[PDB]
């Protein structure tokens, strides 16, 4: 059965950087995109980006452009999110959700497939700044 | 490991959540998947209804020939339930060897329905493809998602690609 | 409650072709089979993916 | 950048009634580009509807939704004690993919 | 114009319906009965040394 | 009361001697004879009663 | 509409009278037809004899165990009645399923005989023909009725036509 | 007469004693033979065990219901051995028609397991061979015993021979 697990909580001062890790098991890690969603206390859900583990393509929202970074290591089956230049507004709970379709486009920015959505969402980690 | 695709004759697809048979591909734009709703709908129709064909439909009511609360004569009691044990033996034998023949046919049939679709695609592309031996065809021209849907859709007019393909197949 | 078959311990009503409760019944019961279970294939042959 | 807005208000109801939530967008897109999530405190969200018209795996039948073009709606035929949570609307029309504001639900 | 050679098997305007393992209204071009329901209302007794008791 | 009691009118079966039915039900340890006795060909009679409709 | 000589994989031929399997063709002289009397005769021989294969051939004479004018005792009459109705329920069930397993095989068997002949013609022409996908082959040279009879007759020597075919098949 | 290595579709090999299926070849060095120990080991496993699946495994102990040294009443004697003859008739009919359905399947199956191996070799060689129609392939390059073992072994990399093969197949 599928299951996504990740690291524990962390605390970091302003101006530092963090690296959350989201490991998966029970399926073939290469397929399926990987979402990344956060939720600041009392705020709704924000969408950060997603990555294509097959070739490392990534796509980020304009709000995080130039600050966020994504990586994937198939040999270990872990998807990483690295965040730099931390501000006091970066305190939230970061998730990681696998998609539900097999497809891909080598550049998720130009994908146009049909019914898809996050599935097997992980558990989330608290980063405090 | 990285990449690589395979079809039947290598293993079954574990990501097929919708449909029995289907396709996969890989080109300059990206990978994908889709099921073949026609063939998978025929097989499911045939197979799932076999339970109702096993039920007897000539119902004959049966009465009691012995008493559950009072004794029966020994001479006739033996004959009464020497037949019963010899009739229960026929039904038990007739069921094991009759379901097994239905299980056997289902396995064989469903596998033939798959080799019929593979040979339907083979004759559709004609001289523009070669089989690599793992259940896929290697297209010798560059065709986009509008071509892949055509191959699934049974609308592939091969005549317009032959010139570009045979140049690559025979290496000028 | 409705039924078409009976046996000393209660009633039997079902859609499966065989039954294994008791041999002595009255009515239009399913035929008695002296086996615990008898499975019928409904899918295809399973051959899982390589790791 | 497509932005989505949801029917405002906590929409407090009593158990056993029928609720209705709506999700509206700035510009039209195909009805297949939508999904519905249910978020309970202290837990990761859960996928309820994908494509705006089909239920997720193992989802109880009481959840259903429909809509086309500009308007998309989610309907809970009957409300049970164990489904009072925040519900979200996400669209897959064009990058970036964005979440709605979120609609709360509470007992009367 | 180009040459050709094609293969096929015969069919009929209308056939009969028979039952099979996977179907219940299967159609075929030709079929035969298997159950007898007609008898002779006489007591055919050729070649047998019979005795009619009578009354 | 035993079915044979219906034709003999034993006290234990007094309530229902005559009647019509479609599914007769017989319990266990039913009373048939009050004054001690026996019936010849009793089994062939109990079967005859349990087939009737009234 | 006009033309078209589609074969099997499209529909059965309604103008066939003199056999089960056969051929058709079309060339510069005209259209035509002829049946295949080898494969046709094999299948008809097997299929038609299955009726006699079902008749019991271990005949055992049976007597009467009850009177058709007098009466029988109730105790024993029931036991006789129970056995008869329980034995009639086995033959009825056994006959329905047994025939269904002979109808099922006949349909599958006869349909393989067609795909065996199609593969026999395919490997006979070799590199001088291509399969158009509707159940028949497109000859890439001009050859007449004496040629068409040869293909049916299994006397087609492909070696003499290869030179003038590959020139047209690959478009010089 | 001399030469000729015709395969299946012409006759069975009488000098093949070490297995069910196998190969043969002929080149500039000699002639030879070898068996395909994989396919023959699977088929032998399935078929040889069908005897034990015909045995009833719900054993129920039976008894005597009529004396072998003393007479019995005529009324019940007829009923006793009117049932025996009617039960012996079901088993005899069931056995004949149940074995025939296993003889039929064994013949069909084992002949399909052979056409699967022929098509496994076919797709292995790709565009470096042409079937001559007697069950075997004509290699269009000169490859020695180290190649012949490769074709059996499933280690045949076609890519390195293609250049020198299509030169001969199309005759420059
Ligand atoms: C017809 O079949 C029935 C059932 O197979 C036979 O009656 C059975 O007789 C055996 C003894 O031969 C009984 O076993 C004993 O029963 C009680 C259980 O409390 C006890 O004394 C022993 O522990 C032992 O188990 C068995 O109960 C009895 N079955 C029934 C349902 O009454 C019968 O013998 C067969 N035909 C003839 C002519 O006897
Ligand atoms: C054993 O089986 C035979 C045959 O199934 C039973 O005989 C049948 O008995 C019924 C009554 O229980 C007869 O039905 C009635 O018959 C006459 C017809 O004029 C009339 O009274 C009613 O309209 C009704 O149809 C039935 O005819 C009779 N069948 C034959 C062939 O004679 C028999 O009762 C069973 N049991 C015993 C203990 O013999
Ligand atoms: C139950 O079946 C048995 C066997 O089928 C029947 O008894 C058989 O009766 C025949 C005559 O109808 C006997 O044949 C004669 O036996 C002796 C042999 O020395 C001799 O008189 C003649 O040459 C002739 O063969 C046969 O032996 C006898 N079988 C046995 C095993 O005793 C029986 O009639 C059937 N049921 C009833 C109710 O009779
Ligand atoms: C159609 O079915 C009938 C009935 O089964 C076939 O009749 C048999 O024909 C064969 C071949 O000539 C004879 O040997 C049999 O004796 C016939 N059987 C009976 C019962 O008459 C008939 O051949 C089938 N085909 C056609 C074209 O009618
Ligand atoms: C013909 O088949 C029989 C039955 O399978 C073979 O005898 C069996 O041989 C196996 C080992 O190969 C033993 O385990 C079985 O016990 C044998 N069965 C019996 C009934 O003795 C026999 O060897 C085969 N003949 C040839 C020439 O191969
Ligand atoms: C798909 O097949 C249908 C049915 O023939 C046809 O109408 C439609 O145009 C096809 N689509 C494509 C893209 O070929
Ligand atoms: C037809 O085949 C027969 C049998 O082999 C042969 O004798 C005859 O010459 C053939 N006829 C033609 C026209 O090829
Ligand atoms: C035969 O096959 C085995 C198993 O793959 C392989 O190890 C061996 O090298 C092969 N031998 C040859 C001569 O190709």
Automatic annotation (TrEMBL), chains B, G, H:
Keywords assigned: Clathrin- and caveolin-independent endocytosis of virus by host, Clathrin-mediated endocytosis of virus by host, Disulfide bond, Fusion of virus membrane with host endosomal membrane, Fusion of virus membrane with host membrane, Glycoprotein, Hemagglutinin, Host cell membrane, Host membrane, Host-virus interaction, Lipoprotein, Membrane, Palmitate, Signal, Transmembrane, Transmembrane helix, Viral attachment to host cell, Viral envelope protein, Viral penetration into host cytoplasm, Virion, Virus endocytosis by host, Virus entry into host cell
Mod. after translation: In natural infection, inactive HA is matured into HA1 and HA2 outside the cell by one or more trypsin-like, arginine-specific endoprotease secreted by the bronchial epithelial cells. One identified protease that may be involved in this process is secreted in lungs by club cells.
Keyword Lipoprotein: yes
Compartments in which it is found: Host apical cell membrane; Virion membrane
GO cellular component, one term: viral envelope
Disulfide links within the chain: 143-147
Keyword Membrane: yes
GO biological process, alphabetically ordered: clathrin-dependent endocytosis of virus by host cell; fusion of virus membrane with host endosome membrane; fusion of virus membrane with host plasma membrane; viral budding from plasma membrane; virion attachment to host cell
Principal place of residence: host cell
GO molecular function annotation: host cell surface receptor binding
Function: Binds to sialic acid-containing receptors on the cell surface, bringing about the attachment of the virus particle to the cell. This attachment induces virion internalization either through clathrin-dependent endocytosis or through clathrin- and caveolin-independent pathway. Plays a major role in the determination of host range restriction and virulence. Class I viral fusion protein. Responsible for penetration of the virus into the cell cytoplasm by mediating the fusion of the membrane of the endocytosed virus particle with the endosomal membrane. Binds to sialic acid-containing receptors on the cell surface, bringing about the attachment of the virus particle to the cell. This attachment induces virion internalization of about two third of the virus particles through clathrin-dependent endocytosis and about one third through a clathrin- and caveolin-independent pathway. Plays a major role in the determination of host range restriction and virulence. Class I viral fusion protein.
Protein family according to the UniProt entry: Belongs to the influenza viruses hemagglutinin family.
Subunit structure: Homotrimer of disulfide-linked HA1-HA2.
Name of the protein in question: Hemagglutinin
Lineage of the species this protein comes from: Viruses, Riboviria, Orthornavirae, Negarnaviricota, Polyploviricotina
Portion held of the full protein: 342 to 513 of 561
UniProtKB/TrEMBL annotation, chain E:
Post-translational modification: Palmitoylated.
Localisation per UniProt entry: Host apical cell membrane; Virion membrane
Sugar attachment sites: 14, 30
Source organism superkingdom: Viruses
Assembly mode: Homotrimer of disulfide-linked HA1-HA2.
Function in brief: Binds to sialic acid-containing receptors on the cell surface, bringing about the attachment of the virus particle to the cell. This attachment induces virion internalization of about two third of the virus particles through clathrin-dependent endocytosis and about one third through a clathrin- and caveolin-independent pathway. Plays a major role in the determination of host range restriction and virulence. Class I viral fusion protein.
Family of this protein: Belongs to the influenza viruses hemagglutinin family.
Protein name per its UniProtKB record: Hemagglutinin
Organism: Influenza A virus (A/Jiangxi/IPB13/2013(H10N8))
Residues of the full protein shown: 16 to 70 of 561
